[PDB]
C-alpha cells in the first residue's frame, strides 16, 4: 500500500476502509496464497497477527504511519485469526474489526459452515443489525436444509409472515433482510416442513429471549450495548498458567442464591424492567437481575476470598426445575435476570474485582420442547435420527448428532461465543460420560457399537477434542473442567497425548470418599482410614478439582452440617475439619453456595438461601472460617504452585488409623514455603502427639480449625512450637503437638526466629 491511501485512512477521508483494512488476497501460488492483513490501531506501537489454529504468530510492521500496520502471510486459507495489539505496556487480543464487509453470508461463510469450521458463524446466522442496499435493517438467517418454506414472524408484522418469506441459499440456509426494524424486535421463525406441518421456532442463534415461559427471540445489537474494562485482567489471564495459581470456586445457581420483592421493578444497568416472579407458588418473590447480582454477589464473593465464581447454566432454558441443565437457547444468557448487557456488566465487574467466571456449559443434550431445536426442519436435524444414539431415554432428552457438520459447528462456535462476547474465564461440562459412551443408560440390544465394535462414541470424542483444542488456542489461560464419572483415561490431559483436552477434572472418588468418611461415627473412622488416603494413589493421573457441588446437597442427601454425626458442636467441627483438609489436600477447590455459612436445609432451587442464619454466631463463625481459609489459600504458595507435581505433596504419616490422624507436607519453589499439615479426625484431643518434620526451627501455627473464633474449643499450640532433635516418621527433627478435637493444623517453619 501507498502513503496516499494510508493518509486517507488516518484523516478520515477514505470512502470505504474495508477496501484497505482487514484481510485481502494479494495473489495465488501453486500450493498456497499470499494475503495481507491491514489494521489501523491508534495509540498502538506494535501489533501481531495470531493464527491460533495453526499455532503461529507474525508481527505487523508500521507502514507510512506509526499506527498503521500491514502484515503479509502465506497460507492456503486465512479464515481464523486475531490481532494482538500493544498500547504502552498493555496488550489485548481481539478479532479484526474489519473482518466482515457486509452483514449477509458470503460463499466463504457457507462453505466453511458446511465443513463445520466456521468459528464465527454466530456473526452471520441469527439476527444482526446491518445495512443492505443502503438501508439500515436486520439480517436474519437460519439453517434448515429440509424445510419447504421459512418466514420471519414478529412484532413488526403482527406475526403474519407472508410479506417476509425467506430465500433459501445453497439448499441449506434461509435468509432475509428487513428494513427499518432493529434491536428490540421480537421475532420467531415460521417453518413449514417436508409434510406441510407449520411450526413456530425460536432462533437457534438468537442472542436474547422473552422471559420464560415465552420463547420468542429478540434482536440484539450485541457489539454496541456495553463498554468493557477488563483488558488488564484478560492480559493477565492470557499470560498465566491457571494450573499454578490458587483456584477456589464459589459455585452458584443465580436464580436461587438471593431473591427480592415482586412488589417492585427489576433494576438493570441504566434501566429497569418488570419483575420476574419465581413461582406461581411463591409470587411475592422475584429474581434478582445480573445488574443487582453484580452489586451483591460479587462483593460477597470478594470478601469471602474466592478466586472464581462458577455458574450453573445460564444459557436460556425454559424450566427452572432443570437447574439450567436443559437448554433451548444456546447463544443467549437467560432473560430471567435481565439483558445481555447486564451479564456483560456482571463479568466486567467480576474482573474489576479479580474474580473469574466459569460457566457450566451443556453440549450433551437438549429437550424436546418444540420452540427449540428438536426436529427443527421437519427432520432429525440437530439430534441423530437413530434413538439408540440420539435420545437419552431416562432423561427424556435428545442427543446432538456430533458427526453432523453444521451441528458440531453450532456447539464449537457456541463455546467460543461465550469467551468472545461475554469474556468468560472457563467452562465446566456436566456428565461427560453421557457423551463418551454409545451405551450410556442403555441395556443389551438397545444400543449399537461403533465401527470397531467398541462402546466409545467416536464422534463425541472428536468433538470434545476439537472444543478443547480451539478453546485453548483462541483463549489461552482459561479453565476447561470436566466431570466424568467412569475411569475414562486422560480426561484432563492434552489432545496430542490422546487426552480429551480438559485441564481439570472433578475428583468424584475423592468426594465420595470424603463425604462417606465424614458421615461415619468418629469411633468407627479407624476402620475407614483408607477413605482419607486412597485418592493419592490415582491422583497424579489427572489434574484434579476437588469439588463438593450442588449435586451433593439435594435429593435428601442433606446439607453439609446435616451429614455430620454428633451434637451441634461436633457437626460444625467436622465441617471445619473436612474443609480445612480439602484446602490443604492437593487440588483446586470448588464449593457450592450455602456450604460456607452452615445452611441446614438442603439447597432448594425454588427458594433462595436461608440468609437469616447469618444473624447467629455459629453461622458467622463458620463464614469467618471460610474467609480466613481462602485468605490463607491465596497467601500460601505451597497450597497452589505444585498441586499437580510430586514435589508438592508428601505424607509425613498416615498409619495411626486408631486415632484417625494423618499428616503431610506441601511444597513450592522456595523451601521456606513448605507447610506441615496435621489432621485429627475425632473429638479425642491429643496432648503430646509427635509428628516428624524435615528441619529444625520454630514452626508457626499458621492456621488451627479449633480456634475459638471459628466455633472451636480453642485447644492448640499457643502459636507455634520448637521442633526437637528427635527422629520420627523417618525424619531427623520432630514436633510434640497438641492436636485439637476434630481439627486441622497448618504449620510453617520460621527460620528467622530467636532461640
Ligand atoms: O487460624 C486460627 C488461629 O490459630 C492459632 O491461634 C490459636 C492457638 O493455636 C491456640 O492454642 C490459642 O493460643 C492462644 C492462647 O489462647 C492464649 O492463652 C495465648 O497463649 C499464651 C499463654 O497464655 C501463655 O501461657 C504462654 O504460653 C507458654 C506456656 O504457658 C508454657 O507452658 C510453654 O508451653 C509449653 C507447654 O506447657 C508444654 O506442654 C510443652 O509441651 O509445649 C508448650 C510449648 O509452648 O511455653 C508457652 C509459650 O509462651 O504464652 C502464650 C503465647 O502468648 O495466646 C495464644 C496464641 O495467640 O488460641 C489461638 C487463637 O484462637 C494461630 O496462632 C492464629 O494465628 C490463628 O489465627
Ligand atoms: O435437491 C438437493 C438434494 O436434497 C436432498 O438432500 C439434502 C438432505 O436431505 C439435507 O438434509 C442436507 O443434508 C446435508 C447435511 O445438512 C450436512 O451435514 C452434510 O451431511 C454429511 C455429514 O455431515 C457427514 O458426517 C456424513 O454423514 O456425510 C453427510 C453427507 O455429506 O451434507 C448433507 C447432504 O448434502 O443436504 C441435502 C441438500 O439440501 C435430497 O435427499 C437429494 O437427493 C437432493 O439432491
Ligand atoms: O478443659 C476441660 C476439658 O478439656 C477437654 O475437652 C474437650 C473434649 O475432649 C473435646 O471433644 C471437645 O468437646 C466438645 C465435645 O466433643 C462436644 O460434643 C460438645 O460437648 C459439650 C456440649 O456441647 C455442652 O452442651 C455440654 O455437654 O458440655 C460439653 C463440654 O464438655 O462440645 C465440646 C466443646 O465445647 O473440646 C473439649 C474442650 O477442649 C479435655 O479432653 C477434657 O478432659 C476436659 O475436661
Ligand atoms: O401486550 C401484548 C401481549 O404481548 C406479550 O406476548 C407476546 C409474546 O412474547 C410472544 O410469545 C408473541 O406471541 C406470538 C407467539 O410467540 C407465536 O408463537 C404465535 O402463536 O403468535 C403470537 C402473537 O400472536 O408475541 C406476544 C404478543 O405481543 C404478552 O406476554 C401478552 O400477554 C400480551 O398480551
Ligand atoms: Mg427466602
Amino acid at each position: 500500500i501507498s502513503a496516499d491511501q494510508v493518509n486517507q485512512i488516518i484523516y478520515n477521508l477514505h470512502h470505504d476502509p474495508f477496501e484497505i483494512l482487514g484481510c485481502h488476497l494479494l495473489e495465488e501460488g501453486k500450493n498456497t496464497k499470499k494475503w495481507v492483513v491491514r489494521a489501523y490501531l491508534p495509540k498502538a506501537e506494535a501489533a501481531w497477527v495470531i493464527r491460533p489454529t495453526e499455532r503461529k504468530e507474525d508481527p505487523m510492521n508500521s507502514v507510512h504511519h506509526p499506527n498503521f500496520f500491514e502484515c503479509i502471510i502465506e497460507t492456503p486459507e486465512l479464515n481464523h485469526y486475531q490481532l494482538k495489539v500493544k498500547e504502552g505496556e498493555h496488550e489485548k487480543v481481539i478479532y479484526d474489526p474489519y473482518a466482515f464487509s457486509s452483514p449477509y453470508l458470503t460463499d466463504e461463510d457457507i462453505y466453511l459452515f458446511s465443513e463445520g469450521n466456521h468459528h464465527r458463524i454466530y456473526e452471520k446466522l441469527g439476527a444482526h443489525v446491518g445495512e443492505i442496499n443502503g438501508v439500515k435493517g436486520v439480517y436474519f438467517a437460519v439453517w434448515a436444509p429440509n424445510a419447504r418454506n421459512v418466514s420471519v414472524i414478529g412484532d413488526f408484522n403482527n406475526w403474519d409472515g407472508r410479506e417476509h418469506q425467506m430465500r433459501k441459499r445453497n439448499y441449506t440456509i434461509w435468509e432475509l433482510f428487513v428494513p427499518e426494524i432493529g434491536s428490540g424486535t421480537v421475532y420467531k421463525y415460521e417453518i413449514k416442513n417436508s409434510e406441510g406441518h407449520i411450526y413456530e421456532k425460536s432462533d437457534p442463534y438468537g442472542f436474547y429471549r422473552e422471559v420464560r415461559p415465552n420463547t420468542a427471540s429478540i434482536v440484539v445489537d450485541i457489539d454496541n450495548i456495553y463498554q468493557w474494562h477488563d483488558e488488564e485482567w484478560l492480559e493477565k489471564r492470557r499470560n498465566s498458567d491457571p494450573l499454578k495459581q490458587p483456584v477456589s470456586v464459589y459455585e452458584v445457581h443465580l436464580g436461587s442464591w438471593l431473591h427480592g420483592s415482586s412488589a417492585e421493578k427489576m433494576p438493570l444497568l441504566n434501566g429497569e424492567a418488570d419483575p420476574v416472579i419465581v413461582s406461581e407458588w411463591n409470587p411475592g418473590a422475584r429474581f434478582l437481575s445480573y445488574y443487582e447480582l453484580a452489586e451483591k454477589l460479587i462483593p460477597y464473593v470478594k470478601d469471602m476470598g474466592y478466586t472464581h465464581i462458577e455458574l450453573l447454566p445460564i444459557a436460556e432454558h425454559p424450566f427452572d426445575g432443570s437447574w439450567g441443565y436443559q437448554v433451548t437457547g444456546f447463544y443467549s444468557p437467560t432473560s430471567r435476570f435481565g439483558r445481555p448487557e447486564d451479564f456483560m456488566y456482571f463479568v466486567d465487574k467480576c474482573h474489576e474485582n479479580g474474580i473469574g467466571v466459569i460457566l457450566d456449559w451443556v453440549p450433551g443434550h437438549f429437550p424436546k420442547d418444540s420452540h427449540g431445536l428438536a426436529y427443527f426442519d421437519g427432520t432429525h436435524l440437530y439430534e441423530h435420527a437413530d434413538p439408540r444414539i440420539g435420545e437419552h431415554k431416562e432423561w427424556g432428552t435428545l442427543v446432538f448428532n456430533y458427526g453432523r457438520h453444521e451441528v458440531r459447528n453450532f456447539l464449537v462456535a457456541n463455546v467460543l461465543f461465550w469467551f468472545d462476547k461475554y469474556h468468560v474465564d472457563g467452562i465446566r461440562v456436566d456428565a461427560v460420560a453421557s457423551m463418551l459412551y454409545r451405551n450410556y443408560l442403555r441395556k443389551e440390544g438397545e444400543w449399537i457399537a461403533n465401527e470397531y465394535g467398541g462402546d466409545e462414541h467416536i464422534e463425541a470424542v472428536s468433538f470434545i477434542r476439537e472444543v478443547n483444542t480451539l478453546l485453548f488456542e483462541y483463549f489461552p489461560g482459561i479453565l476447561s473442567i470436566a466431570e466424568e464419572s467412569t475411569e475414562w483415561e486422560k480426561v484432563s490431559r492434552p489432545v496430542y497425548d490422546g487426552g480429551l483436552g480438559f485441564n481439570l477434572k472433578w475428583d468424584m472418588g475423592w468426594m465420595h470418599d470424603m463425604l462417606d468418611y465424614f458421615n461415619i461415627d468418629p469411633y468407627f473412622r479407624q476402620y475407614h482410614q483408607n477413605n482419607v488416603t486412597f485418592s493419592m494413589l490415582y491422583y497424579y493421573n489427572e489434574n484434579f478439582m476437588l469439588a463438593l457441588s450442588h449435586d451433593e446437597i439435594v435429593h435428601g442427601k442433606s446439607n453439609m452440617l446435616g451429614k455430620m454425626p454428633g451434637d451441634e458442636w461436633q457437626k460444625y467441627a467436622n465441617v471445619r475439619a473436612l474443609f480445612t483438609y480439602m484446602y490443604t489436600h492437593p487440588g483446586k477447590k470448588t464449593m457450592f453456595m450455602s456450604m460456607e455459612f452452615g445452611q441446614w436445609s438442603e439447597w432448594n432451587v425454588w427458594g433462595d438461601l436461608e440468609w437469616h442464619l447469618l444473624q447467629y454466631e455459629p453461622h458467622q463463625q463458620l463464614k469467618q472460617f471460610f474467609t480466613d481459609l481462602n485468605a490463607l489459600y491465596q497467601q500460601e504458595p505451597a497450597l497452589y504452585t505444585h498441586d499437580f507435581e510430586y514435589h508438592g505433596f508428601e505424607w509425613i504419616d498416615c498409619n495411626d488409623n486408631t486415632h484417625s490422624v494423618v499428616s503431610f507436607l506441601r511444597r513450592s519453589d522456595d523451601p521456606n514455603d513448605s507447610l506441615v499439615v496435621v489432621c485429627n479426625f475425632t473429638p479425642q484431643p491429643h496432648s503430646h502427639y509427635r509428628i516428624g518434620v524435615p528441619e529444625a526451627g520454630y514452626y508457626v501455627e499458621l492456621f488451627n480449625s479449633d480456634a475459638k473464633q471459628y466455633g472451636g474449643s480453642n485447644m492448640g499450640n499457643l502459636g507455634g512450637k520448637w521442633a526437637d532433635e528427635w527422629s520420627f516418621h523417618n525424619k531427623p527433627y520432630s514436633l510434640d503437638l497438641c492436636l485439637p478435637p476434630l481439627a486441622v493444623l497448618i504449620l510453617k517453619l520460621d527460620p528467622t526466629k530467636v532461640p
Side-chain angles (χ1 to χ4, degrees), residues 60 72 87 112 223 265 277 287 315 464 531 677 691:
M60 304 192 78
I72 296 167
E87 281 145 19
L112 261 184
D223 297 334
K265 317 285 252 161
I277 303 309
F287 293 131
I464 286 158
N531 292 38
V677 181
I691 296 291

Side-chain angles (χ1 to χ4, degrees), residues 518 525 561 564-565 567-580 622 625 680-683 705-706 710-713 740-744:
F518 276 87
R525 292 174 181 175
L561 287 166
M564 300 317 183
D567 64 9
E568 170 163 313
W569 187 91
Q570 321 212 327
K571 273 172 159 60
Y572 280 81
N574 281 292
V575 171
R576 293 187 290 275
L578 166 52
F579 279 98
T580 309
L622 192 67
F625 157 89
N680 169 20
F681 296 150
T682 92
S705 106
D706 200 42
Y710 304 148
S713 72
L742 288 173
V744 175

Side-chain angles (χ1 to χ4, degrees), residues 143 145-146 168 171-172 377 403-406:
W143 181 52
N146 305 297
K168 202 191 200 216
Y171 313 103
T172 179
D377 71 347
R404 193 159 180 178
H405 292 310
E406 297 81 335

